[PDB]
Amino acid sequence: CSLDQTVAPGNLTLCGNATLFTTFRPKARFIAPEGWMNAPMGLYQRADGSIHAGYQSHPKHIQWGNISQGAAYSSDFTSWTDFNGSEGYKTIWPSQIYDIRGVFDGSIIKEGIDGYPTILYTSTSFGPLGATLNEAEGTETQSLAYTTDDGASWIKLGYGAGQNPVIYEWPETNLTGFRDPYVFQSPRLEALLANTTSITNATGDHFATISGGVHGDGARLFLYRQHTTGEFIKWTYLGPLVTTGYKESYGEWSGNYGINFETAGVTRLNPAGAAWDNGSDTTAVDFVTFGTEQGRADHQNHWPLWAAVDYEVRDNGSIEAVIAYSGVQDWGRSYAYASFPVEGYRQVSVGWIYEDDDNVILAKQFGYQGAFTLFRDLFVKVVENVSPSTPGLFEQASWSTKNSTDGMSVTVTTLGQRVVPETLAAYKGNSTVSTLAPVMLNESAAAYTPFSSQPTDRFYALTGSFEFGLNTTAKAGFRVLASEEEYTDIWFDPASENLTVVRTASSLIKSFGNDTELAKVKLYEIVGAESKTLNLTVFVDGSVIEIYANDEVALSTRAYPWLANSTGAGLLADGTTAGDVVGVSGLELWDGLVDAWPARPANTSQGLVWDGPTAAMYGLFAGY
Amino acid sequence: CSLDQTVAPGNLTLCGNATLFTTFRPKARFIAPEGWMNAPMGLYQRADGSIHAGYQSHPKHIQWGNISQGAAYSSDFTSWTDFNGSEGYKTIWPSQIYDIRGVFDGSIIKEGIDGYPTILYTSTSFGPLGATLNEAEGTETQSLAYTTDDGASWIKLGYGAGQNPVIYEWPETNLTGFRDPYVFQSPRLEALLANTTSITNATGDHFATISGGVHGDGARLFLYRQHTTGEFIKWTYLGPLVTTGYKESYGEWSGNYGINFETAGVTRLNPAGAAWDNGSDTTAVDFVTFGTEQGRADHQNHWPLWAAVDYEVRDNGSIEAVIAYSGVQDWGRSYAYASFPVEGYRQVSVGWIYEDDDNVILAKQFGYQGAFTLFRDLFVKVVENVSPSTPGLFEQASWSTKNSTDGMSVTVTTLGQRVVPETLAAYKGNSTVSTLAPVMLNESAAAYTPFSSQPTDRFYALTGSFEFGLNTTAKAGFRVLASEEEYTDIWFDPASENLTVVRTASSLIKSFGNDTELAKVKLYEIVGAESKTLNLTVFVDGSVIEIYANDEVALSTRAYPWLANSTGAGLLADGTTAGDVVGVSGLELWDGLVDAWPARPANTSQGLVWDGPTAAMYGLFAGY
Ligand SMILES: *[C@@H]1O[C@H](CO)[C@@H](O[C@@H]2O[C@H](CO)[C@@H](O[C@@H]3O[C@H](CO[C@H]4O[C@H](CO[C@H]5O[C@H](CO)[C@@H](O)[C@H](O)[C@@H]5O[C@H]5O[C@H](CO)[C@@H](O)[C@H](O)[C@@H]5O)[C@@H](O)[C@H](O[C@H]5O[C@H](CO)[C@@H](O)[C@H](O)[C@@H]5O)[C@@H]4O)[C@@H](O)[C@H](O[C@H]4O[C@H](CO)[C@@H](O)[C@H](O)[C@@H]4O[C@H]4O[C@H](CO)[C@@H](O)[C@H](O)[C@@H]4O[C@H]4O[C@H](CO)[C@@H](O)[C@H](O)[C@@H]4O)[C@@H]3O)[C@H](O)[C@H]2NC(C)=O)[C@H](O)[C@H]1NC(C)=O
Ligand SMILES: *[C@@H]1O[C@H](CO)[C@@H](O[C@@H]2O[C@H](CO)[C@@H](O[C@@H]3O[C@H](CO[C@H]4O[C@H](CO[C@H]5O[C@H](CO)[C@@H](O)[C@H](O)[C@@H]5O[C@H]5O[C@H](CO)[C@@H](O)[C@H](O)[C@@H]5O)[C@@H](O)[C@H](O[C@H]5O[C@H](CO)[C@@H](O)[C@H](O)[C@@H]5O)[C@@H]4O)[C@@H](O)[C@H](O[C@H]4O[C@H](CO)[C@@H](O)[C@H](O)[C@@H]4O[C@H]4O[C@H](CO)[C@@H](O)[C@H](O)[C@@H]4O[C@H]4O[C@H](CO)[C@@H](O)[C@H](O)[C@@H]4O)[C@@H]3O)[C@H](O)[C@H]2NC(C)=O)[C@H](O)[C@H]1NC(C)=O
Ligand SMILES: *[C@@H]1O[C@H](CO)[C@@H](O[C@@H]2O[C@H](CO)[C@@H](O[C@@H]3O[C@H](CO[C@H]4O[C@H](CO)[C@@H](O)[C@H](O[C@H]5O[C@H](CO)[C@@H](O)[C@H](O)[C@@H]5O)[C@@H]4O)[C@@H](O)[C@H](O[C@H]4O[C@H](CO)[C@@H](O)[C@H](O)[C@@H]4O[C@H]4O[C@H](CO)[C@@H](O)[C@H](O)[C@@H]4O)[C@@H]3O)[C@H](O)[C@H]2NC(C)=O)[C@H](O)[C@H]1NC(C)=O
Ligand SMILES: *[C@@H]1O[C@H](CO)[C@@H](O[C@@H]2O[C@H](CO)[C@@H](O[C@@H]3O[C@H](CO[C@H]4O[C@H](CO)[C@@H](O)[C@H](O[C@H]5O[C@H](CO)[C@@H](O)[C@H](O)[C@@H]5O)[C@@H]4O)[C@@H](O)[C@H](O[C@H]4O[C@H](CO)[C@@H](O)[C@H](O)[C@@H]4O[C@H]4O[C@H](CO)[C@@H](O)[C@H](O)[C@@H]4O)[C@@H]3O)[C@H](O)[C@H]2NC(C)=O)[C@H](O)[C@H]1NC(C)=O
Ligand SMILES: *[C@@H]1O[C@H](CO)[C@@H](O[C@@H]2O[C@H](CO)[C@@H](O)[C@H](O)[C@H]2NC(C)=O)[C@H](O)[C@H]1NC(C)=O
Ligand SMILES: *[C@@H]1O[C@H](CO)[C@@H](O)[C@H](O)[C@H]1NC(C)=O
Ligand SMILES: *[C@@H]1O[C@H](CO)[C@@H](O)[C@H](O)[C@H]1NC(C)=O
Ligand SMILES: *[C@@H]1O[C@H](CO)[C@@H](O)[C@H](O)[C@H]1NC(C)=O
Ligand SMILES: *[C@@H]1O[C@H](CO)[C@@H](O)[C@H](O)[C@H]1NC(C)=O
Ligand SMILES: *[C@@H]1O[C@H](CO)[C@@H](O)[C@H](O)[C@H]1NC(C)=O
Ligand SMILES: *[C@@H]1O[C@H](CO)[C@@H](O)[C@H](O)[C@H]1NC(C)=O
Ligand SMILES: *[C@@H]1O[C@H](CO)[C@@H](O)[C@H](O)[C@H]1NC(C)=O
Ligand SMILES: *[C@@H]1O[C@H](CO)[C@@H](O)[C@H](O)[C@H]1NC(C)=O
Ligand SMILES: *[C@@H]1O[C@H](CO)[C@@H](O)[C@H](O)[C@H]1NC(C)=O
Ligand SMILES: *[C@@H]1O[C@H](CO)[C@@H](O)[C@H](O)[C@H]1NC(C)=O
Ligand SMILES: OC[C@H]1O[C@H](O)[C@H](O)[C@@H](O)[C@@H]1O
Ligand SMILES: OC[C@H]1O[C@H](O)[C@H](O)[C@@H](O)[C@@H]1O
Ligand SMILES: OC[C@H]1O[C@H](O)[C@H](O)[C@@H](O)[C@@H]1O
Ligand SMILES: OC[C@H]1O[C@H](O)[C@H](O)[C@@H](O)[C@@H]1O
Ligand SMILES: OC[C@H]1O[C@](O)(CO)[C@@H](O)[C@@H]1O
Ligand SMILES: OC[C@H]1O[C@](O)(CO)[C@@H](O)[C@@H]1O
Structure with missing residues (x-):
């Protein structure tokens, strides 16, 4: 194997493992020390203001498996330090019958078990697992763990009745998937449901969505509500939050909704960033971000999407999120966007950029696969004084339009994304x-x-x-x-x-x-x-x-x-x-x-x- | 629930968990602190002369599951002390993809990995498992762990190529079972195979049997030989040691060979106890002990048997153990006998006595299930000057007969079992x-x-x-x-x-x-x-x-x-x-x-x- 980059490349498949480790490797972004990584997970701002970032990780391999949480921290989204413990840079790994097949994506309850940061994650066990397979109940469940040392280690609840896993029953039959629990507080959803809590008895201050779908009938985002404030075992299924059709598309600006959702999240934004009002802020917009699968001919059959939604309260004390307009979070080789709250009324989003070596020809020679995107502030992008002659403007595909009183100008609203200013400042x-x-x-x-x-x-x-x-x-x-x-x-x-x-x-x-x-x-x-x-x-x-x-x-x-x-x-x-x-x-x-x-x-x-x-x-x- | 033992029993199924804990409980023998136990395992005499006894264990349950090694030690087979560590009295438990379904029976290599006592055990994973089911390769494999603290804890080899599990390929197709590795040294087998080692290249000083059978075609005991002395990863399959027919019976004195073997062991004995000669001791007899399943209408379909065998060397450098006579180790509610060497030329055997509550009516009320038998010295029982008019004597069913020169008397040889003298002395x-x-x-x-x-x-x-x-x-x-x-x-x-x-x-x-x-x-x-x-x-x-x-x-x-x-x-x-x-x-x-x-x-x-x-x-x- 020759590594002479002044002449044409030879047959690089003859090169040894990790001989091309530095050749193409990012230096300025979040990436695992080595091996396989995919989705961001377990994202939260710690008590000291620093950012904890987890990721789906398979060290010393270049394909997915034994999937675990690798982790690191940063005070500015930009310069990072790895955790180092008994399992290297891993902090959660398959260890119990309920999660031995993989510790899949999860999200953080900041004040959880005994007041500690707590992760709710998808714990997987044996059996067919996938949207194109015949999955059964139990293969994907949801489990809790908490940290007493700010993410250096996590302690799982015990296996059994009234303990882990905490969510195991499928809310409907023939699911295509049942994973990626996204836990969030929402004054908005609390206010909407406040008159219906006698119907369900769910009165907690945390909600959770679980991503999936139904065989032959499109994707689903399922909404759960914590049953009682301060208690983390019981989560009550309210109903489907987002329901889309089998390979339904809202159009050219909106990708395709595929057959199954992954890594879905729920947020509320206004022009400045994150909004935590109960509905009273007329400038705020409710958003869902989500991956879809099998609605795309390439890019690993994966679309990372978002939608602005209008919430309606159902008679059974659940919420329908009606899509108002629908867009794309990233148009290239990225997926599995996660968003999390950050102090100063921010919501920050980050995804996974996969390699472009889908036949796995040089992965061993790399000795790693995958990186993160940059970290992005989400906000409501408002463009004022837009000309009505802008071509295609009233399709309102991935934006909304509001006319002025006189009809001579338009206000455009859409999802804004920009690189976090800490990274732009540090880079420059x-x-x-x-x-x-x-x-x-x-x-x-x-x-x-x-x-x-x-x-x-x-x-x-x-x-x-x-x-x-x-x-x-x-x-x-x-x-x-x-x-x-x-x-x-x-x-x-x-x-x-x-x-x-x-x-x-x-x-x-x-x-x-x-x-x-x-x-x-x-x-x-x-x-x-x-x-x-x-x-x-x-x-x-x-x-x-x-x-x-x-x-x-x-x-x-x-x-x-x-x-x-x-x-x-x-x-x-x-x-x-x-x-x-x-x-x-x-x-x-x-x-x-x-x-x-x-x-x-x-x-x-x-x-x-x-x-x-x-x-x-x-x-x-x-x-x- | 009334516990008045001066009047007739009420409806004891109304009693709470473990309310009958002491009522029927053995006090003078090996038994777990609580919950489910079954087979003895990991038996060895430690460097200090004390006895380490392991057992299949499921604490805080009264049926089998998450099966683990519980352990204790004794200086006299009779008075015991529990290990106490991070998992209570457990010392090996399901923890890896290869053993998450259960840490099944195993046996001890006294000088193993880095010179430490080392267990070779059946590591189980997902899939149908059983002699009456359609089991597949990988569900039962064999793995190693070693102890640096005399059995207080065990360290497993890593998962992967050239590490755990160390034996995974089925030696034949359509096995009914593939478990219970019994590791032993044998000057006898070494001498028999010494002229054939160029055929197989297996020259190590440890042999291992694995218990199983073939669907529709009877039980099998498979013989492996350590490939190289001092190295514990590579074990070479020689061939079947014992082959019996589908529900074959040697007769009224010999139980039934069923469809599948479990917990089989190999020993060599003489009138005093254990024999470690290379064949030169004409008073020594080769024995196999083994459980069989599905050859019995009751006693949980289980026979604990033994057979005297005559070894023949095959042309492919393997050993056939030809059954010379065949008996029963215990005729009652016991099974899963394990034997191990003890200083002073002894071989000591111990089994598991199950309860007689097969419909699980009062198990929760007990709060435990199972005990050991007493520990038994094995030896060759020789009876001299036997009368030829002893009824049935020349059937030679579970014994051998040898006539005197004049034909007026007979010497009878069979397997002897007696309670270890340490226990008899302490009891009295x-x-x-x-x-x-x-x-x-x-x-x-x-x-x-x-x-x-x-x-x-x-x-x-x-x-x-x-x-x-x-x-x-x-x-x-x-x-x-x-x-x-x-x-x-x-x-x-x-x-x-x-x-x-x-x-x-x-x-x-x-x-x-x-x-x-x-x-x-x-x-x-x-x-x-x-x-x-x-x-x-x-x-x-x-x-x-x-x-x-x-x-x-x-x-x-x-x-x-x-x-x-x-x-x-x-x-x-x-x-x-x-x-x-x-x-x-x-x-x-x-x-x-x-x-x-x-x-x-x-x-x-x-x-x-x-x-x-x-x-x-x-x-x-x-x-x-
Ligand atoms: C099959 O069998 C498997 C093996 O048996 C089984 O897995 C085991 O399951 C059990 C039961 O769920 C688990 O036990 C729990 O463990 C939790 C702690 O877990 C962490 O720590 C342990 C122990 O760590 C020691 O030892 C290790 C190993 O040597 C060291 O590395 C550590 O440094 C530490 O060492 C010190 O201590 C040792 C003695 O313990 C000393 O020997 C040593 O010298 C040191 O001093 C680790 O082993 C764990 O690691 C494993 O798990 C993690 C994931 O969590 C993995 O990543 C890792 O790889 C390992 O697999 C882990 O790090 C306990 O917290 C828990 O006890 C609580 O819950 C039980 C049950 O509810 C209660 O009875 C108990 O009282 C505890 O609850 C109280 O405390 C919590 C908070 O502290 C409260 O939230 C709770 O309300 C309650 O409060 C009480 O006390 C308060 C007073 O302060 C009071 O105010 C309250 O009112 C209340 O009374 C439980 O013991 C065990 O970890 C599993 N083990 C493994 C290896 O997996 C498996 O499930 C079985 N499978 C099936 C299918 O059945
Ligand atoms: C999916 O992911 C899973 C998680 O990643 C993965 O499981 C993990 O697999 C890895 C890889 O196999 C395992 O790593 C091995 O670990 C062995 C040690 O195992 C014991 O100890 C660890 C660590 O214990 C510390 O931490 C715990 C937890 O906090 C504490 O409880 C302990 O007290 C102890 O704490 C001290 O140290 C900490 C730092 O480590 C400090 O933070 C702390 O303050 C303390 O000071 C335990 O975690 C283990 O527990 C787990 O496993 C047991 C069963 O074994 C369970 O019962 C339990 O529940 C847990 O699950 C366990 O107790 C290492 O020995 C081993 O390293 C050797 O092998 C590798 C690979 O071959 C070599 O690279 C390495 O060099 C080592 O080999 C040398 O040493 C041995 C003998 O020491 C020699 O035989 C060998 O030849 C070689 O010698 C070398 O050195 C000599 C010099 O002395 C020289 O002479 C020679 O020439 C030669 O160079 C390896 O690290 C890991 O344990 C698993 N973890 C878990 C949680 O399961 C899983 O497999 C994955 N699954 C899939 C499907 O992929
Ligand atoms: C004494 O020890 C026991 C452990 O042995 C402790 O725990 C109890 O254990 C028993 C089993 O021994 C459990 O019984 C089973 O319960 C099932 C129904 O559960 C739900 O209802 C009960 C009653 O109101 C609730 O208490 C449960 O709540 C607990 O669990 C939930 C999780 O679901 C947690 O969120 C809670 O916090 C609690 O921890 C549940 O809500 C029931 O389905 C099951 O029934 C089968 O078995 C019985 C008896 O044989 C049959 O009558 C019945 O027809 C079912 O039969 C099955 O039999 C075979 C083999 O299994 C199958 O093939 C069949 O198809 C069929 O399904 C069983 O009754 C009990 O729930 C559990 N209690 C707990 C955890 O609280 C006790 O706590 C302990 N007592 C004390 C005081 O310490
Ligand atoms: C560089 O990294 C790699 C890890 O990626 C390290 O380990 C090597 O990893 C590769 C896989 O990347 C292994 O290749 C596979 O080998 C199989 C045959 O193995 C046996 O032969 C080899 C060669 O003589 C021996 O070295 C092995 O010995 C080791 O393993 C045994 C256990 O079996 C241990 O006891 C030893 O101690 C060693 O640890 C074995 O004896 C082979 O079957 C497999 O072939 C598949 O894949 C290739 C490539 O794609 C295809 O050409 C082939 O047709 C097969 O294709 C499969 O593809 C799909 C998907 O898997 C299936 O659906 C198909 O049906 C089909 O099966 C593969 O070639 C390699 O064995 C392993 N080497 C080890 C552990 O030593 C390297 O060590 C590391 N290098 C360095 C220097 O550090
Ligand atoms: C029954 O037990 C007795 C008592 O141990 C046995 O008879 C003794 O055998 C020993 C050892 O061979 C002799 O040293 C004693 O002299 C015998 N005592 C007698 C005859 O009173 C007897 O062999 C045992 N019988 C059976 C059938 O096992
Ligand atoms: C770059 O390197 C190539 C290969 O060595 C060389 O042919 C060429 O002159 C260099 N410069 C540019 C701008 O291509
Ligand atoms: C590159 O080397 C591989 C062996 O890794 C070989 O199979 C392949 O055909 C080679 N490509 C060429 C000669 O173009
Ligand atoms: C509430 O009603 C909706 C709409 O019919 C339904 O999809 C959901 O499953 C219901 N919630 C329940 C049954 O908890
Ligand atoms: C919005 O403005 C455009 C251009 O003036 C006009 O065609 C359209 O009818 C207006 N819509 C409403 C709701 O007034
Ligand atoms: C360089 O980058 C570091 C790490 O992100 C940052 O803290 C520092 O402020 C940057 N230096 C500048 C902007 O001069
Ligand atoms: C034993 O107890 C029973 C029940 O209390 C009583 O009837 C009987 O007289 C006692 N003695 C014997 C030897 O049965
Ligand atoms: C004993 O109590 C059980 C309830 O545990 C009941 O179902 C059973 O019929 C009772 N037996 C009687 C009354 O004989
Ligand atoms: C050796 O021969 C015996 C008898 O035919 C056979 O059962 C065994 O599988 C052979 N050993 C091998 C193929 O390693
Ligand atoms: C053994 O002894 C019995 C009784 O004397 C006799 O019937 C039988 O034929 C003898 N067997 C041999 C092999 O001599
Ligand atoms: C009583 O039993 C203990 C424990 O086995 C034993 O060590 C002791 O020797 C016995 N006492 C006697 C025989 O007097
Ligand atoms: O199904 C009952 C309810 O569901 C819908 O979401 C409607 O918004 C609401 O008006 C209706 O009463
Ligand atoms: O930025 C801090 C934010 O994060 C917290 O997790 C809360 O959900 C939110 O109310 C708070 O404002
Ligand atoms: O199959 C080959 C060998 O097998 C048998 O065990 C015979 O004892 C031996 O004589 C024969 O040569
Ligand atoms: O009693 C001690 C005996 O145990 C050992 O494990 C050896 O296999 C044996 O040769 C020795 O005599
Ligand atoms: O590694 C598994 C994880 O990756 C995803 O498939 C998205 O790519 C998630 O749905 C899942 O939790
Ligand atoms: O607990 C599992 C163990 O029990 C046995 O079935 C015997 O009863 C063994 O064959 C096995 O290793």
């Missing part, structure tokens, strides 16, 4: 920052124009504001991770409303994914403006390319160029002319970002292991 | 001993004649030698646990050769078993004698009645009389006349025996618990 302050002169793209514009300052490695951020004519047919954007022979092109095409990432040339290594990524972006045209603007922020972090547009649209993807000098960046231009010009301003390169794991050495591999011939006998885990 | 020395005058049973003999001294409680031993005429039709024996209305009758009937325990009147409580127990006993008649003698030793210990005849025949059973004064004992006589007399001598009562668990209070119940509705969902354990 630790980088070599180059503020670039504005560039007018016209008839003289080359297809690709390198920036006047260049990155020095695969760890950088770009900002730019692209001003387009209202009837443009020009395309513009950013090329990143670029040499002569390898590059990744990020294009926006206002005429089609499509933001694309073209990866046909991303790498000389042919085994990685190369499909074109696509997001829809609505440029809301402002009354009196003679142009429309796209504000792009792009993070390049090893192999991760994470794109944010207008504090609204996110697209995470992967690129794995082999050559050491495929690190360049610049402007892309297509169909720009003397008449159809694209004005680029607010241009900035942040070279270096932050070393997110300062205590870790460059290579944190501990080698890879095989479970042996029993893995195929048990049939639960791949075994490697 | 701690008891109030009454030496009773000989009693001649003739025409004046009543049906029942109380002993001149009586027991004071349900903890005593009786000895007696019964001298019968060679053509007698009289019956005699012992009545125990006797008042006017409740009693248990132990009869021997030389004409039929049957030792019986009649339990039609054992208790006023009708829910307990009342079937007549039966053992065959051959009184080998001595040349020149005008009579034949039965030496009986009987232990009464709470509800256990354990009978030994002529250091050969054992019969364990249960009796649960309600009345406080059902403690008496005496002689039984039937058909004794002036001409057909039974001379009883060597009569002795030992009243009290030994307090076997001096540190335990009278009531060691910790209550009983229910696993809850998930027990039926998982389908592995009853749940209570």
